[PDB]
Amino acid sequence: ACYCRAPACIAGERRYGTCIYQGRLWAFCC
Numbered sequence: 001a002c003y004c005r006a007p008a009c010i011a012g013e014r015r016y017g018t019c020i021y022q023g024r025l026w027a028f029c030c
Contacts, residue, residue, distance in 0.1 A: 001029055001030065002028060002029065002030040003028075003029055003030075004019035004021050004026045004027070004028055004029070005026060005027050005029045006024070006026045006027065008027050009026075009027050009029035010027060010029070012019070013029040013030060014029070015028065016028050016029070021024055025029050
């Protein structure tokens, strides 16, 4: 499952681009 996270994905997850959330650049993590 994928979630938008800060400041980076939690280890074990892989990043698939970024997500602008509340106007902030976060990581899209699955």
